[PDB]
Symmetry: D2
């Protein structure tokens, strides 16, 4: 535990599960007053009870929901000091034509547009106040090819939006960065194992360190960038991926040189 | 003029103006049978008359329009050999909160989703046929910071989608690449001068030029052609050195004449 | 039919073999007056006889050789219109400690420093004359991880130097770009097969298009960038790799769908 | 507390001044046993008196110096747990031809080759023991164009080498990452002000946050990556630049909105 965020209001979207839960837990253990924001109130309530945080009902796919949630935070607590955008959904890894356009649309709406909605609603007041730190959650899938024709582009959009906002709000004292997880142990990744969409040993083999990343490891990088340890860092994308991005190019040379 | 695309069916979206028009002109001068596709039927027809191409009514923001256009092409001409995705719109350069969410949505719908709609509708038949070349139009704005919180992310999405498709369809023999224009002289840029200042754009590029639509088209046509037979999944900036020049300010700026 | 150079003077380093040979051949077929430059005069002569170009002895690891070559070009032909830096060497794919420091030093000296030597010697006069186009040869190995602790860094150095020079000389009308080949069929790649450092089917499998790149395919990209068809392109790195950079990230999803 | 190292041995090169000094200081405050390594014993002694660390004479431009220093660390303390490569030099911002080749060579030898020498000498034993964390210092100048035809390429080389080593040694449990500072307040930057090579207000204006980066701010990112809080991070380049990389592209739109 630490006092690094004592007094800080930290809104974490998607905080009921996975990466957002781990960020909420670490921010709370670091002293922050965490707003546990999720569309799933049961999950958010469980996390808030464990962290001492406060729940906020938030559907990032619904403009009215985001606007209302932002107004509730301002009225009840104050201008957010930290915003972490973890709400997101995955997609089936289907090629164009097999992937339903409806599925493509949902991924874009939640993962890119929903992050924009929250940055605008929670972050514009930060720029007005002249202080704040925003951390978005992108993905290695936003950085390289893969069978994710909605999720890849949406996460690449998050990397871009992190850069555009960092330039817009830098002169107003707000830092905006993003973390790009590799394959991270969460209930979403477990559902991929259950549908046989992914295989755990295949994911380990695809990473230079031979590990699947833990939600807590992602949260450490988010909290670093959200904190004053990162006071000079803005507009960056930090991959936390156990070396996934490193390993793929070794196959032409016979693969990683393993134990 | 050349025969490099003799016999090829080349669908160009947004071909009524600007970059798409220059691509249609150069593809036609290179021998292709150009399908001049646009939401603006009068503009498409002017370009088709000049190029010997054929018009195709296409609104990349309407799924039914894209599906019908792809079906017309397949029945009247055949499977496309080349698809160039130039249809697109710009946005007002407003910060979050000032930019209307409706404006953000339109840009994402046309510039990213509309390119996906056309890649799926025209490009899946290419993958089934085991040959084709697709060139998307991104932007330097998809590569660096700027005051375009819809357009930047959408164009970054185009760069990503070019990569994801190149991997999906590489084993089926379809190459997918993208060109990222800098500031390019088109009627859309002229509307910016009447938001943007021409001297400022020249100063922001290492070569001191605004890119012409024809210069963009040369890069598109290179990537679409067999001169690029081993090139897939790449983003080619055609920007007069905009991406190069910004980092010089800390050292006193470009060292000019 | 790829471009027209109208007699432009084009100096190609490493032009006796592989990528440089293919660049010299296509430039000559495209109307350029090619200067076939190489450390191996016998290989340069063979290529120059086939291209109608002229030979130039050039060892990019020897400062005096680069200076003397630039002086010969200036006196005999004039300032170059095009420079293509293809001279290069590979390395054994050994981890640090197994890799001899002497091997590391050679690769850095030839592949990065030697390209800098030629850009300074042949390219500064281009900037003085307010025109020219320079194409460097980097590699996908300068863009991603691999067992190449000298060659990767040197080729990443070439990508950077392309950007730095593009900015220095952009205002003087000189474009500077680079091509990053993937695995390309040359005698240097053949030595990787013979020594069993590389396996041809493994290289095809590692590319989204399932091919090894040909030297001519690299030359087409070099010639495009060197030509007026690329008059607005500067400071860019163009990968020509059959989709090597694309394919590696698919393994986590079960690999390429073949 | 930024991190806890529990007595881990941390070798910091260039630790007598600037970024290396700040890294040594924060590592010591975070519980590491710091080895303050520098070519200048006087500066290293001053830093080590403040950190309780131990001094090591190290010239990263002399192979025998690096080898002897690694042997002394192994003999006196053990295999390093952490290595931070901060030894470096800048260059005059001159175009090719005006920049002496001797100046180009020094920058490449110290900034890229010297980092490779240290990664090989101190890092191969880490891979052998199956544990360690290495942080290299690159620069934003290794990521974008500028008037730095040696320093840009050398620092791009460091970003590459970080990736190549991360792949080589990842399977042996060693993480390798790098930090790319922007303009950072050190004696080296002050020499740029004194020579009027740089102007402080120009550097602030070129960053989205309007600041010059402090040496301590760089050290925080180095210590995060070196620590177990970054146990899943390898092969990455983390810019710490107050938004320099963000700001340049705004000029076309009228500049930053201040
Ligand atoms: N798990 C991975 O391997 C991985 C990898 C890369 C990126 N990511 C990204 O990290 C973030 C979280 O991933 P996760 O693994 O923690 O998934 P998760 O399913 O375990 O948690 C996601 C949370 O987001 C909430 N949520 C979903 N849609 C929402 C909506 N419209 N409005 C509000 N809340 C919504 C969910 O209720 C859920 O609690 C996502 O952006 C994900 O794309 C995850
Ligand atoms: N001009 C530049 O500086 C510049 C820079 C970077 C990127 N781009 C991109 O190049 C592409 C073309 O730009 P331009 O300068 O030629 O603009 P332009 O206005 O001159 O031409 C754009 C064409 O797209 C058509 N179009 C717009 N929406 C459409 C829709 N839903 N369906 C079908 N057609 C539609 C328009 O009718 C028009 O004919 C765009 O993607 C643009 O974002 C332009
Ligand atoms: N073949 C590939 O797969 C591949 C991949 C990526 C990059 N590259 C790069 O392409 C360029 C050409 O490679 P290649 O495959 O054609 O090799 P190659 O052996 O077929 O030809 C290389 C030429 O460079 C000459 N040369 C070597 N050192 C020289 C020196 N100091 N001075 C003058 N000439 C010298 C050689 O005599 C030879 O003629 C190199 O830079 C290489 O690193 C090659
Ligand atoms: N200051 C900046 O703005 C900035 C920006 C980007 C990157 N960097 C990089 O950070 C690192 C340190 O920069 P700094 O500002 O702290 O410089 P500095 O002059 O303040 O300190 C550098 C230290 O490196 C030592 N050193 C130099 N050459 C050496 C050699 N052969 N062997 C051993 N020690 C040697 C010096 O004795 C000195 O103590 C460098 O790699 C630099 O390139 C600095």
């Amino acid at each position: 535990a630490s006092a690094e965020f004592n007094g800080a209001i930290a809104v974490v979207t998607g905080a009921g599960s996975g990466i957002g839960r781990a960020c909420a837990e670490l921010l709370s253990r670091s002293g922050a007053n965490v707003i546990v924001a999720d569309r799933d109130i049961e999950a958010a309530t469980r996390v808030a009870r464990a962290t001492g945080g406060k729940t906020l009902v938030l559907d990032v796919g619904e403009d009215a929901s985001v606007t209302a949630a932002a107004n509730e935070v301002r009225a009840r607590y104050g201008v957010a000091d930290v915003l972490v955008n973890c709400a997101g959904v995955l997609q089936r890894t289907l090629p164009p034509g097999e992937l339903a356009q409806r599925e493509w649309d949902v991924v874009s709406r939640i993962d890119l547009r929903g992050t924009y909605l929250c940055c605008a609603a929670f972050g514009a007041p930060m720029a007005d106040r002249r202080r704040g730190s925003i951390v978005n959650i992108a993905s290695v899938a936003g950085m390289r090819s893969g069978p994710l024709h909605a999720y890849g582009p949406a996460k690449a959009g998050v990397i871009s939006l992190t850069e555009t906002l960092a330039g817009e709000w830098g002169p107003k004292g707000v830092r905006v960065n993003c973390v790009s997880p590799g394959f991270t142990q969460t209930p979403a990744l477990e559902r991929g194992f259950t549908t046989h969409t992914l295989k755990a040993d295949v994911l380990r083999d695809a990473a230079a360190l031979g590990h699947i990343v833990s939600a807590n490891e992602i949260a450490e990088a988010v909290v670093f960038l959200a904190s004053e340890r990162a006071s000079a860092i803005t507009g960056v994308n930090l991959p936390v991926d156990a070396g996934y991005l490193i390993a793929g190019s070794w196959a032409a040379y016979g693969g990683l040189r393993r134990e």
